[PDB]
Amino acid sequence: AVGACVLCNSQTSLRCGACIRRPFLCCKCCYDHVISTSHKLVLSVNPYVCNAPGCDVTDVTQLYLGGMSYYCKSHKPPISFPLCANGQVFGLYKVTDFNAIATCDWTNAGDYILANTCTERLKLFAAETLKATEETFKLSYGTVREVLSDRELHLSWEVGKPRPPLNRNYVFTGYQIGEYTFEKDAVVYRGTTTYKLNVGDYFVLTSHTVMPLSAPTLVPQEHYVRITGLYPTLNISDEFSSNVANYQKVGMQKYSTLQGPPGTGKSHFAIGLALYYPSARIVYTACSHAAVDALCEKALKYLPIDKCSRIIPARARVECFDKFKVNSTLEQYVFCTVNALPETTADIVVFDEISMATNYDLSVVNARLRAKHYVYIGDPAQLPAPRTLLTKGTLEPEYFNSVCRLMKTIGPDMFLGTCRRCPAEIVDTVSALVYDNKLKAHKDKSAQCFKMFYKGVITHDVSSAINRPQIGVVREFLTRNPAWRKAVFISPYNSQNAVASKILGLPTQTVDSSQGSEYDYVIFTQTTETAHSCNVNRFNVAITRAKVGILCIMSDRDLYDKLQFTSLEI
Ligand SMILES: [Zn+2]
Ligand SMILES: [Zn+2]
Ligand SMILES: [Zn+2]
């Protein structure tokens, strides 16, 4: 029960029993915390409480030290001194920001802003407090009535508690018969495992214990004068020649940031780093299984298949890359999600899709992976990890995580400025929208990029929006543009996606789940004109999925006018 103060590192024996993480606080800092918040319980070898029989006084400001025990004003002996005096709480070895992180409920965007602009140690405490606050709430949200078929169900809920939204962010566990997701009387049930399940089975949200954090989100930066710990090859392929200047900067710094807009070659950069440093052992990590899978696919073409291994938790979350040797931690090239990372060492660590990472994830990576060099690849102009507790305000990219903050304040170390995937109409649009006209297009205009302003009629299934007339507009477009039936339908709402799947028969994806993918033809309906559907990062992701053509049914005049597409009438 002896440690370092979370604000001043000054050693102390006092903890705050009211904070959910019970951090160590120094005599001065613990004082400033109890007099400015409702947190009044102080812990030590023994709890600072009145030891008189039947007394419930726990406020440290109402407690004194008499003998070797603690008492209140009504039980203290004549010879006693106050625990709280001289700007200090009594302990061994005898701020405004810390109070806010410790007492907020993480429902306002200002809470996440403070968690990214504070000192480095407060970032660790905030990430701990946030994840702990997120987990407790899970134990509280609100049974199959009848099985109709092999993919839909009728559900009945528990009495007295609200219903959690039915999407992919909320994964239920049925009863360890596997993890399930639901989507919206009829509801679609999708269990990762095909276990049998009759009427009466109940499902509960899967909770994962929050472990305390110790490693920082970012290691201390170190700049070198020569390539350290690595041996660069001289005969690099001409496919990776343009990255040699930035490849050398990787070996001369502890960490490096790379902002890669869509289609600029992020995975091409990451895989070629292994060819430029052929003797290095590399762990490729990311938050999602799809991001690590994309890095596996690029590796299969360029890296020896016998030196690659994909780490899969027996948790069998989803089907992952099955073309590398499974669960071989000691291989040269290791592909693994952050949550499943083993405790090992590496020459370089590549963290992909950095905008989807939380400050918790940055800490787990540093705690499990000791490496000579870390490279963070991503794009703060794309989508972040969902903060389910955040309901008031929008989280700006500078407050996504420590890495995204640096990319937006001082800029990224390296930048990929040429998009090779999208037609010029899409590139010019997003370049002016979120990239300061610094993103150039390798392709010409395709003349297959169209936009249409059509508000339609907005209906809602609970909280997910639907715009059937916008789908009807798409229907009429398909009958007149037959080559587009191979397109992918994208929208910001799962429900609009479910309706479009039945009416149009196209493959469907949400904008958030389409990040990292690319398709020849994309059809996008904005559905609504909300802050969710008008988010510039979401929109940037949505329209940069197309390789050849895109059709945008717009609800927002601003974003409609900013689209440099040909307008179609109907
Ligand atoms: Zn506290
Ligand atoms: Zn302190
Ligand atoms: Zn008492």
UniProtKB/Swiss-Prot annotation:
Effect of D238Y: In strain: Epsilon/B.1.427/B.1.429
Compartments in which it is found: Host endoplasmic reticulum-Golgi intermediate compartment
Domain ((+)RNA virus helicase ATP-binding): residue spans on this chain: 235-416
Residues annotated as domain (+)RNA virus helicase C-terminal: 417-570
Reaction catalysed by this enzyme: ATP + H2O = ADP + phosphate + H(+)
Start and end residues of each CV ZBD domain: 1-105
Taxonomy, superkingdom: Viruses
Ranges for the LRR repeats: 206-226
Consequence the record notes for mutating M407I: In strain: Kappa/B.1.617.1
Amino-acid positions noted as binding Zn(2+) 12 in the UniProt annotation, renumbered to this chain: C16, C19, H33, H39
Binding site for Zn(2+) 13: C50, C55, C72, H75
Chain positions recorded as a ribonucleoside 5'-triphosphate binding sites: G260, P261, P262, G263, T264, G265, K266, S267
Residues the record lists as binding Zn(2+) 11: C5, C8, C26, C29
Variant or mutagenesis effect after changing N246S: In strain: Omicron/BQ.1.1
Description of how the protein assembles with itself and partners: Interacts with nsp8 to form the replication-transcription complex (RTC): nsp12, nsp7, two subunits of nsp8, and up to two subunits of nsp13. Interacts with host TBK1; this interaction inhibits TBK1 phosphorylation and decreases by 75% IRF3 phosphorylation, which leads to reduced IFN-beta production.
Reported function: Plays a role in viral RNA synthesis. Multi-functional protein with a zinc-binding domain in N-terminus displaying RNA and DNA duplex-unwinding activities with 5' to 3' polarity. Activity of helicase is dependent on magnesium. Binds to host TBK1 and inhibits TBK1 phosphorylation; the interaction with TBK1 decreases IRF3 phosphorylation, which leads to reduced IFN-beta production.
Name of the protein in question: Helicase nsp13
Organism: Severe acute respiratory syndrome coronavirus 2 (2019-nCoV)
Gene name per UniProt: rep
Residues of the full protein shown: 5325 to 5916 of 7096
